Every structure is written in structure tokens, then in C-alpha cells.
Design a protein around this ligand. Structure first.
Ligand SMILES: Cc1cc2nc3c(=O)[nH]c(=O)nc-3n(C[C@H](O)[C@H](O)[C@H](O)COP(=O)(O)OP(=O)(O)OC[C@H]3O[C@@H](n4cnc5c(N)ncnc54)[C@H](O)[C@@H]3O)c2cc1C
Length: 383
């Protein structure tokens, strides 16, 4: 009397979809080939950044799915009431916020959603790697690579397996899918701003700089940002071109001089010798942009959410927020159609694709104003 569902991917989007589906009564199994991140045996926690910005909407999405833990999950998240722009003279300026934004720890949020799933019907399959799907007109046979095979069968499948979605590949045999993938020159380095030693009254904690703002040091074709953490430290990220970075990392002192010159107001609060070490032992990461049409196999057999459907630019686009919104849109559609996945999924591709071609235009307009169009003397160096 209940339909069963396979969810491929236990990242932020995958879990949230598992929650929203248990909550509706479906029989959720959730797979990931990586190990349970909650076990410290796992070295690789698949953590792209230490923390993220979760918008009003992403909170609203997570709310409608798990109204309960939406507050024993979003506890320590820090609300940032605007941006703080840092010019080259270290001068810093508050620009208040249409939609608000909060700093939340990624590994924590990913782990909290996992826990919430144990308090529900959902079975969790870690160490399982989806490798093939056969498409019948009733139940879909999924094959896995543990450890060496295994299979299983399901009324329908959800691909939540990120940017190189195996589920997307399998779907591409069954459907004519417009597909595009682009690799950007954009690279990112993770830096760190330690907590001050003493409690700072004006900031409500051990924060070197204002924790209720998203700190941006906008330069020409590159950028430094910072977001507060609960302990007083800031997760900091450097974004620039692959070519800029690779010309820099050849000379240990070069990187150093680059930093001091472009971000003078961060030497006091950051450990510079280690900042250089971070830049050079920086792990190459492909950044891919992907698009998909449609998001689903006809007759409600399968669907794509998260990066699997639409991997966008870090920072300028908001992946996680969008994946969360995906789930909310999907469920609301399943209700309007009373459980008809075939008529729901179909409308999902219709309306989501409208949304997400406009969304990947506000991530270019955002690339434009903040990063490409930087020429003024306050944000650009003259030797
Ligand atoms: C540096 C950086 C900062 C970012 N900051 C923000 C931000 O502030 N706000 C925001 O909204 N977005 C941000 N994003 C984008 C955001 O991180 C992603 O869009 C989001 O994590 C997508 O999650 P996902 O669950 O869809 O996919 P993923 O995080 O990629 O998770 C998919 C899971 O599927 C698993 N998997 C893959 N293949 C298989 C297989 N076939 N079988 C089983 N499992 C499989 C993977 O192991 C993975 O755990 C940022 C991205 C980066 C790189």
C-alpha cells in the first residue's frame, strides 16, 4: 500500500529529500558510496567548504520538511545582516540587506539531517555505489558496488548524487536529455581566521571582526570572503582564476606579497605563513557547471535534485539553497496532484526549468557586479 523510493546521495540535498519522503509515508532507502561521515574512521568527509550561507528560503524549505529539528539543527547558525566590504585601504563598509542570510557549519548540518533520519523509517545504506539502473514500467532495478556486487528494486528513484551524477547517466539512456557541462577557471582556497583570545563585548564573542556581516574583499577578477563560526573564528575563502593561482603558487614569497598587498587588513587577524602554506598545498578541484532537461524519466520513474540537476558556481550561485528549494517545490507538487508522481515530476521539469534558467542568470549578474566590473581605485591596485 506504500510505494518505495531509492535516493542516490547523502549530501545536503539527498538527506533533505529522504526526510521529506519518509514524512510523506514513502519507503525510503538512502545510498552513498562514501562512508558515514559521523564516524571519525572516515578521513574524507566530502566537505567542499567548512561552512555555508543558508538563506531565508533554504531555512523555509528545511522548515516545511522538518519543522521540529529545524530549531535543534539551526541552533548555532549565525545571522548576517549584510555585507561588509573591505577596500584596499582596509576601509570597511556596511551594506545592509531583499533576503537575509545565516552562517551554518556544513559538516554539522549534514550530520544533523542524518540523525533526524534515524528517528524515522528510512534505512541508510552507506558504502553502496550506484553503478547501473534498469528501467522497467513498474519497478527499477538498481545495482551497487560495495566494499563485489548487489541489487534491489524500487517504484521510483531520486538522483541526489552531485555534479557527476551516475543517476543522471543512467537516466540518459532512457530519455533524450539536453545536457551541458562546463569547467570554470574558478578555483577556491580555504583560509582561516582564528578567534581572538578575549571575549569582545561589541561582537558577542571571540570575533576578530564583525560576525553579523558577510565579509568581502572584492578585487579585480578575484575575491576573499569570510563567515563567522560559533567559536569566534571565521571560515575564509579565496576565489580566483586557475591561472592567477598557479602563477602565484610557484614562489612562496610571491603568494605572501600578493596577500599583504591585496588584503592588508587581514595580516593582523590571520596567520600569514600558514595562509601561504594553504595556498600552495591547495588541492586542485574541478569546478563544473551542469544543466539538464528534463529532470525526470516519464511516468514518475526518476528525478534529479541538487547538483545532479544543476551544479552552479560557488558563491555567485547558491547550490545548497537551490537544492533545498528543489525538495520543497517537488513535494508541494506531489500534494497538488495527490500522489501522482508522473503528473508531478512532469510539472516539476516544466516549472523548475523556468526558475533555474533565470537563477543561473542572477549568478552571472552577481559575477558581474562583484567580481568582473571592479575598476575603481578603492578596490584595484595601481603599483
Ligand atoms: C566552496 C563552496 C562553497 C559553497 N557555498 C555555498 C553556500 O554558501 N550556499 C549554498 O547554497 N551553496 C553553496 N555551495 C554549493 C553547494 O555546496 C552544493 O550545491 C551542495 O552541497 C549540493 O549538495 P548535493 O547534496 O546536491 O550534492 P553533493 O554535496 O555533491 O552530495 C551528493 C552525494 O552523492 C554521493 N554520490 C555520488 N555518486 C554516487 C553514487 N553513484 N552512488 C551513491 N552515492 C553517490 C556523493 O558521495 C555525495 O555525498 C558551495 C560550493 C562550494 C564548492
Amino acid at each position: 500500500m506504500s510505494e518505495s523510493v531509492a535516493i542516490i546521495g547523502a549530501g545536503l540535498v539527498g538527506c533533505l529529500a529522504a526526510l521529506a519522503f519518509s514524512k510523506e509515508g514513502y519507503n525510503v532507502t538512502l545510498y552513498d558510496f562514501r562512508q558515514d561521515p559521523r564516524l571519525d574512521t572516515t578521513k574524507n568527509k566530502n566537505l567542499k567548504s567548512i561552512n555555508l550561507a543558508i538563506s531565508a528560503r533554504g531555512i523555509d524549505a528545511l522548515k516545511s520538511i522538518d519543522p521540529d529539528a529545524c530549531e535543534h539543527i539551526l541552533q548555532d547558525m549565525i545571522p548576517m545582516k549584510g555585507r561588509m566590504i573591505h577596500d584596499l585601504k582596509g576601509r570597511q563598509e556596511s551594506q545592509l540587506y531583499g533576503e537575509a542570510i545565516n552562517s551554518i557549519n556544513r559538516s554539522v548540518l549534514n550530520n544533523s539531517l542524518l540523525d533526524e533520519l534515524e528517528k524515522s523509517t528510512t534505512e541508510l545504506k552507506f558504502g553502496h555505489k550506484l553503478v547501473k539502473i534498469e528501467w522497467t514500467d513498474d519497478k527499477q532495478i538498481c545495482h551497487f558496488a560495495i566494499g563485489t556486487p548487489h541489487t534491489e528494486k524500487y517504484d521510483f528513484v531520486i538522483g541526489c548524487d552531485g555534479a557527476y551524477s551516475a543517476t543522471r547517466s543512467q537516466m540518459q539512456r532512457k530519455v533524450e536529455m539536453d545536457f551541458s557541462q562546463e569547467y570554470m577557471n574558478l578555483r577556491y582556497i580555504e583560509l582561516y581566521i582564528p578567534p581572538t583570545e578575549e571575549f569582545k563585548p561589541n561582537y558577542g564573542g571571540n570575533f576578530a571582526i564583525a560576525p553579523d556581516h558577510l565579509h568581502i574583499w572584492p578585487r579585480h577578477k578575484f575575491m576573499l570572503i569570510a563567515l563567522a563560526n560559533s567559536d569566534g573564528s571565521f571560515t575564509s575563502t579565496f576565489f580566483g582564476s586557475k591561472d592567477q593561482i598557479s602563477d602565484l603558487i610557484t614562489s612562496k614569497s610571491r603568494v605572501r606579497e600578493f596577500l599583504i598587498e591585496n588584503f592588508p587588513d587581514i595580516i593582523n587577524i590571520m596567520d600569514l605563513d600558514d595562509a601561504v602554506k594553504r595556498f600552495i598545498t591547495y588541492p586542485k578541484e574541478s569546478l563544473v557547471c551542469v544543466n539538464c532537461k528534463p529532470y525526470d524519466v516519464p511516468g514518475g520513474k526518476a528525478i534529479l535534485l541538487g547538483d545532479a540537476a544543476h551544479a552552479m558556481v560557488p558563491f555567485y550561485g547558491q547550490g545548497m539553497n537551490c537544492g533545498f528549494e528543489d525538495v520543497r517545490i517537488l513535494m508541494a507538487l506531489l500534494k497538488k496532484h495527490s500522489g501522482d508522481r508522473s503528473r508531478a515530476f512532469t510539472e516539476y521539469t516544466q516549472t523548475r526549468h523556468k526558475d533555474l534558467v533565470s537563477i543561473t542568470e542572477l549568478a552571472k549578474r552577481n559575477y558581474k557586479e562583484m567580481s568582473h566590473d571592479v575598476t575603481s581605485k578603492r578596490f584595484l591596485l595601481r603599483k
